[PDB]
């Protein structure tokens, strides 16, 4: 079973934290599953 790591996006408002979060999720599934 895979190691589990907790991360998160911090930074100033409107700099892209949430959009990047969506991107990570998308690109990763698309590429590895």
């Amino acid at each position: 079973t895979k190691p589990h790591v907790n991360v998160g996006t911090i930074g100033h408002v409107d700099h892209g934290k949430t959009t990047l979060t969506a991107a990570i999720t998308t690109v990763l599934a698309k590429t590895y599953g």
């Binding site: 790591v5 907790n6 100033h12 998308t26």
Partner: protein
């Protein structure tokens, strides 16, 4: 209670599984980081290349240092807007400096230049950068240490004396493992006492060992049920020491969250809830501040009336007669 706005998403890379938080506003980040609601083994600092660092950028990094986030990876976003190799290099230098300012290795810190927007739209030249970031999540953040691998720590929730067998302390093992026969220390409040685990029971079923996460009862060799004071903890000898003075970051609930209506000033002596009890303490605010408003977060040096077993990162509540008025994390112990 504390109002908290968060997003929790999970995803995978070929070798690891990730749990990722994202909060809408600055206040959320503050509340989350301090209350430990959202704990992080590593953080992704997002900085729009168009605006460069900003106040919250700085504040988040500082908060990170304070609450104990060990690593930070940077993602220069909105690069699909800039096109001056010169400009970007500028922003980077700014950021690395900024990280170094707060003791993060600004030089060795990975910085990916990308575009969250384009990547999301499907443009593969940009999706590439997302994969690069993921690579750093995998390589840069070391695999975190599991609860069971840490030294034994058990916050005592109650005490009992079972006839002819001895004194039984109960509680949930916070971390590590305790095996019958092992020697343990009782630390906090009074002077550290030593003893031997002569047994581990759980609803009469006799056990071998008590493991992190389990609600067990630990049997102690010759130590009266009255020598145990509320607030003390059971721990692997020499792994945790009692302290009274520490520096910390705190969030003071707003009126709406059910906190104070009025600000407090120097000389405020509230009670600090550590695991199981309140412990009164004095407050040293930073220079220049003479009053703290409800809803503010502030650096604060605290001095406890009795010593409590603690290490960097321990969370606590500030209470005014049972009522919770604030929450904090121990940024660094002093004595």
């Amino acid at each position: 209670g504390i109002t908290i706005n968060t997003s929790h998403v999970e995803y995978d890379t070929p070798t690891r599984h990730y749990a990722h938080v994202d909060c809408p506003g600055h206040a959320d980040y503050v509340k989350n980081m301090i209350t430990g609601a959202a704990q992080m083994d590593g953080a992704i600092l997002v900085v729009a290349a168009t605006d460069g660092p900003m106040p919250q950028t700085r504040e988040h990094i500082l908060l990170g240092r304070q609450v104990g986030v060990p690593y930070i990876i940077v993602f220069l976003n909105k690069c699909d807007m800039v096109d001056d190799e010169e400009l970007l290099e500028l922003v980077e230098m700014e950021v690395r400096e900024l990280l170094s300012q707060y003791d993060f290795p600004g030089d060795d810190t990975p910085i990916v230049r990308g575009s969250a927007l384009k990547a999301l739209e499907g443009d593969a030249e940009w999706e590439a950068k997302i994969l690069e970031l993921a690579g750093f999540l995998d390589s840069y953040i070391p695999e975190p240490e599991r609860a069971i691998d840490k030294p034994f720590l058990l916050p005592i929730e109650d005490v009992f004396s079972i006839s002819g067998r001895g004194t039984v302390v109960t509680g949930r093992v916070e971390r590590g493992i305790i095996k019958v026969g092992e020697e343990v220390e009782i630390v906090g409040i009074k002077e550290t006492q030593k003893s031997t685990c002569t047994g581990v029971e759980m609803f009469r079923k006799l056990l071998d060992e008590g493991r992190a996460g389990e609600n067990v009862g630990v049997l102690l060799r010759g130590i009266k049920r009255e020598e145990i004071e509320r607030g003390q903890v059971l721990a692997k000898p020499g792994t945790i020491k009692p302290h009274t003075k520490f520096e910390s970051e705190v969030y003071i609930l707003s009126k709406d969250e059910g906190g104070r209506h009025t600000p407090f000033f120097k000389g405020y002596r509230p009670q600090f809830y550590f695991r199981t009890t309140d412990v009164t303490g004095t407050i040293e605010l930073p220079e220049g501040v003479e009053m703290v408003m409800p809803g503010d977060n502030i650096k604060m040096v605290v001095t406890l009336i009795h010593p409590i077993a603690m290490d960097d990162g321990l969370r606590f509540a500030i209470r005014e007669g049972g009522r919770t008025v604030g929450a904090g994390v121990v940024a660094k112990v002093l004595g």
